[PDB]
Design a protein around this ligand. Sequence first.
Ligand SMILES: *[C@@H]1O[C@H](CO)[C@@H](O[C@@H]2O[C@H](CO)[C@@H](O[C@@H]3O[C@H](CO[C@H]4O[C@H](CO[C@@H]5O[C@H](CO)[C@@H](O)[C@H](O)[C@@H]5O)[C@@H](O)[C@H](O[C@H]5O[C@H](CO)[C@@H](O)[C@H](O)[C@@H]5O)[C@@H]4O)[C@@H](O)[C@H](O[C@H]4O[C@H](CO)[C@@H](O)[C@H](O)[C@@H]4O)[C@@H]3O)[C@H](O)[C@H]2NC(C)=O)[C@H](O)[C@H]1NC(C)=O
Ligand SMILES: *[C@@H]1O[C@H](CO)[C@@H](O[C@@H]2O[C@H](CO)[C@@H](O[C@@H]3O[C@H](CO)[C@@H](O)[C@H](O[C@H]4O[C@H](CO)[C@@H](O)[C@H](O)[C@@H]4O[C@H]4O[C@H](CO)[C@@H](O)[C@H](O)[C@@H]4O)[C@@H]3O)[C@H](O)[C@H]2NC(C)=O)[C@H](O)[C@H]1NC(C)=O
Ligand SMILES: *[C@@H]1O[C@H](CO)[C@@H](O[C@@H]2O[C@H](CO)[C@@H](O[C@@H]3O[C@H](CO)[C@@H](O)[C@H](O)[C@@H]3O)[C@H](O)[C@H]2NC(C)=O)[C@H](O)[C@H]1NC(C)=O
Ligand SMILES: *[C@@H]1O[C@H](CO)[C@@H](O[C@@H]2O[C@H](CO)[C@@H](O)[C@H](O)[C@H]2NC(C)=O)[C@H](O)[C@H]1NC(C)=O
Ligand SMILES: *[C@@H]1O[C@H](CO)[C@@H](O[C@@H]2O[C@H](CO)[C@@H](O)[C@H](O)[C@H]2NC(C)=O)[C@H](O)[C@H]1NC(C)=O
Ligand SMILES: *[C@@H]1O[C@H](CO)[C@@H](O)[C@H](O)[C@H]1NC(C)=O
Ligand SMILES: *[C@@H]1O[C@H](CO)[C@@H](O)[C@H](O)[C@H]1NC(C)=O
Ligand SMILES: [Cl-]
Ligand SMILES: [Cu+2]
Ligand SMILES: [Cu+2]
Ligand SMILES: [Cu+2]
Ligand SMILES: [Cu+2]
Length: 559
Amino acid sequence: EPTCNTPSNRACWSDGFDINTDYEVSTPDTGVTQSYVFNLTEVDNWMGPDGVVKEKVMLINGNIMGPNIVANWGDTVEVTVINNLVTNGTSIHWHGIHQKDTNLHDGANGVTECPIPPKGGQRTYRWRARQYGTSWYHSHFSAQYGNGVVGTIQINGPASLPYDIDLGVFPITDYYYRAADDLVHFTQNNAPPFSDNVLINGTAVNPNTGEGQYANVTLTPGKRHRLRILNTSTENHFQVSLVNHTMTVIAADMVPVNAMTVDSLFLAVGQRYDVVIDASRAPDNYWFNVTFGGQAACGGSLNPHPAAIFHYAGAPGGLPTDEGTPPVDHQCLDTLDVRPVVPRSVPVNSFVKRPDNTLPVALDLTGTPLFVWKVNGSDINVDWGKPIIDYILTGNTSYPVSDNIVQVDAVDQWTYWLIENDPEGPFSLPHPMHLHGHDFLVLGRSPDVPAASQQRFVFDPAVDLARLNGDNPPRRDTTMLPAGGWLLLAFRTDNPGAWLFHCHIAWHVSGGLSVDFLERPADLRQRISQEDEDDFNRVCDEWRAYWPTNPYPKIDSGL
Ligand SMILES: *[C@@H]1O[C@H](CO)[C@@H](O[C@@H]2O[C@H](CO)[C@@H](O[C@@H]3O[C@H](CO[C@H]4O[C@H](CO[C@@H]5O[C@H](CO)[C@@H](O)[C@H](O)[C@@H]5O)[C@@H](O)[C@H](O[C@H]5O[C@H](CO)[C@@H](O)[C@H](O)[C@@H]5O)[C@@H]4O)[C@@H](O)[C@H](O[C@H]4O[C@H](CO)[C@@H](O)[C@H](O)[C@@H]4O)[C@@H]3O)[C@H](O)[C@H]2NC(C)=O)[C@H](O)[C@H]1NC(C)=O
Ligand SMILES: *[C@@H]1O[C@H](CO)[C@@H](O[C@@H]2O[C@H](CO)[C@@H](O[C@@H]3O[C@H](CO)[C@@H](O)[C@H](O[C@H]4O[C@H](CO)[C@@H](O)[C@H](O)[C@@H]4O[C@H]4O[C@H](CO)[C@@H](O)[C@H](O)[C@@H]4O)[C@@H]3O)[C@H](O)[C@H]2NC(C)=O)[C@H](O)[C@H]1NC(C)=O
Ligand SMILES: *[C@@H]1O[C@H](CO)[C@@H](O[C@@H]2O[C@H](CO)[C@@H](O[C@@H]3O[C@H](CO)[C@@H](O)[C@H](O)[C@@H]3O)[C@H](O)[C@H]2NC(C)=O)[C@H](O)[C@H]1NC(C)=O
Ligand SMILES: *[C@@H]1O[C@H](CO)[C@@H](O[C@@H]2O[C@H](CO)[C@@H](O)[C@H](O)[C@H]2NC(C)=O)[C@H](O)[C@H]1NC(C)=O
Ligand SMILES: *[C@@H]1O[C@H](CO)[C@@H](O[C@@H]2O[C@H](CO)[C@@H](O)[C@H](O)[C@H]2NC(C)=O)[C@H](O)[C@H]1NC(C)=O
Ligand SMILES: *[C@@H]1O[C@H](CO)[C@@H](O)[C@H](O)[C@H]1NC(C)=O
Ligand SMILES: *[C@@H]1O[C@H](CO)[C@@H](O)[C@H](O)[C@H]1NC(C)=O
Ligand SMILES: [Cl-]
Ligand SMILES: [Cu+2]
Ligand SMILES: [Cu+2]
Ligand SMILES: [Cu+2]
Ligand SMILES: [Cu+2]
């Protein structure tokens, strides 16, 4: 753990480990393990934080969110998940945790494991904390995490800027009264709805009844505070800001970045931002605002002004008085100005669009249901009863077309992927793309234009090769795919396994927007221990025995 990490020197951690250490290839071994136990229950007619009683929710240990995972850079995190839901199977994915050589602990049901059966099923996840920062976890059993199976992850380590207080996690999520399975069914033939409310750190005031309450953050006058903001929504994409205050980003997702002071921030579904706010203003109460932009192209809420209160220690304690000015419209796009502390460099002068490096996203309105998302001609649909890893363990290469298997044999090399966002269809929407097992490099994207303008673009070397940047570009696990445009990413094949690459909007991945990167399959088998294998077969045997008795059918892709 830490020894030299002080308020005025956060760059220091322990001998041989600091903010400049390449955390991707060097990990401190503390020999320490942090354990947790997740009890999943299905609660009917549960009263929410704003006053409304939801029809049904799924909770980890009876709370709106699971427990905050907390550990030090280099420790081992272990979580026993006991599934006490009535019918649903379940899987907990650790969003942001690359799972280096531990693919079978990724929590991607139908891909790296069968779901943990209901009514008592259990399985223990175990992974090493090889990266420090802020992340989160959630179910991957369809849109289940929309009912409550979600929580945060805080792995301590160095920082690119000194600060006095670490305020901790600050999850911002959209909140719907209807249940995930109902919304999934609804979104298969209807446009997605606005969120009934937006929760800031678990709470919110009902805009109709006045019930509920504002999240209350207390700043220590004169001190610099670290705030870890996350967006754990199923659809809503946010914009945040603090009246009369700026924010200095020091981390994008779980990647530390050079200090970048901003006025507001756009956070896509699944993104995080570690910021340092300085209590240098007059003691008072200020509004922390959540606003939307991009003309509803990436979300909207029925609560016109979701917000929290930042109270200065010592000032009166009422509601803030200054409503402030609306932040700039970020047009459903994240900033590409972030520069990671630990650099990366990849050539882009030699890129060339090809069928095997291009992933065309399309919306198919000709079949059933109405809204079906496809990538390279197919809507993904995994088999909960026979994940891809089972094929790997049985020398079976007959992968069904539905699994959208994109095999990458390259050994520890940079791979380039151009994702095209339905440039030829009726209409295109912004899509937050996310990759399991790695942090990709955002080499570039189509020109920034209003998200609703419906302008289209198609990669054109004559103009775009000049727009690409491979000189330490933003590195992270989630970034925005411009509406009607394209996006060029890159990730190094340093981690054998089956990795999902999907859109994090629940409604979409559910509808099929996803592929499965089968990375270095030949090296994969040799690296799966007898234990992960046996337990894999164990959980799969229990799930296969259960399924036939399930009273419900699988309605979507299962992801
Ligand atoms: C994991 O665990 C989950 C929790 O139990 C579980 O979810 C439940 O799944 C079951 C089965 O899939 C669901 O029940 C089915 O729901 C079907 C759809 O009903 C809902 O939508 C109706 C219309 O909504 C849309 O409307 C637009 C237009 O406006 C259309 O374009 C769109 O296509 C949709 O039609 C709506 O009328 C329903 O309202 C009722 O239910 C809701 C939710 O319970 C409630 O709030 C309302 O007040 C009202 O009671 C729903 O919103 C429905 O078609 C099914 O019924 C048909 O099929 C059965 C069997 O085939 C047949 O007997 C019937 O006669 C009928 O033909 C059925 O009711 C249930 O809603 C889910 N519960 C929740 C809370 O999410 C998961 O299934 C489980 N996962 C797995 C894999 O096990
Ligand atoms: C950050 O979050 C906080 C907390 O949620 C936000 O604070 C709220 O801010 C809104 C203002 O947008 C405020 O609502 C007003 O309350 C007044 C109470 O009397 C109303 O008079 C006022 O109504 C007018 O504005 C509405 C638009 O919001 C119109 O729909 C309505 O028709 C009214 O319009 C009149 O005035 C305009 C110009 O002034 C004129 O053109 C029209 O013809 C008409 O005459 C609002 O309802 C809440 O009271 C605030 N909540 C609290 C507890 O303070 C804050 O806005 C957020 N800040 C940012 C930057 O997002
Ligand atoms: C948000 O949380 C903060 C932190 O607890 C709350 O601040 C506290 O507010 C109360 C009053 O609202 C303060 O107490 C008051 O102090 C005055 C001065 O001594 C006294 O005259 C009053 O009778 C009362 O005791 C308290 O000091 C203050 N805490 C600090 C250290 O700032 C705030 O009220 C919360 N806001 C909301 C909307 O709930
Ligand atoms: C998308 O699917 C197409 C099949 O239609 C794949 O394209 C083929 O790729 C192989 C290997 O590079 C080539 O030999 C064929 O000539 C390609 N066919 C076409 C359409 O020209 C493509 O690889 C898939 N893309 C991804 C990344 O999965
Ligand atoms: C490889 O995996 C496939 C799954 O895609 C297996 O195919 C199934 O085999 C059973 C027979 O035991 C049939 O009842 C199913 O209908 C088959 N489904 C498909 C998709 O064909 C296959 O048996 C496995 N065997 C290999 C190739 O090793
Ligand atoms: C989970 O919690 C519920 C109630 O909170 C309890 O009934 C059940 O026995 C618990 N399951 C386990 C094994 O923890
Ligand atoms: C979020 O809420 C928890 C308890 O509900 C609190 O301990 C934490 O400090 C809050 N986050 C911040 C930084 O306000
Ligand atoms: Cl991930
Ligand atoms: Cu995620
Ligand atoms: Cu993930
Ligand atoms: Cu999407
Ligand atoms: Cu995922």
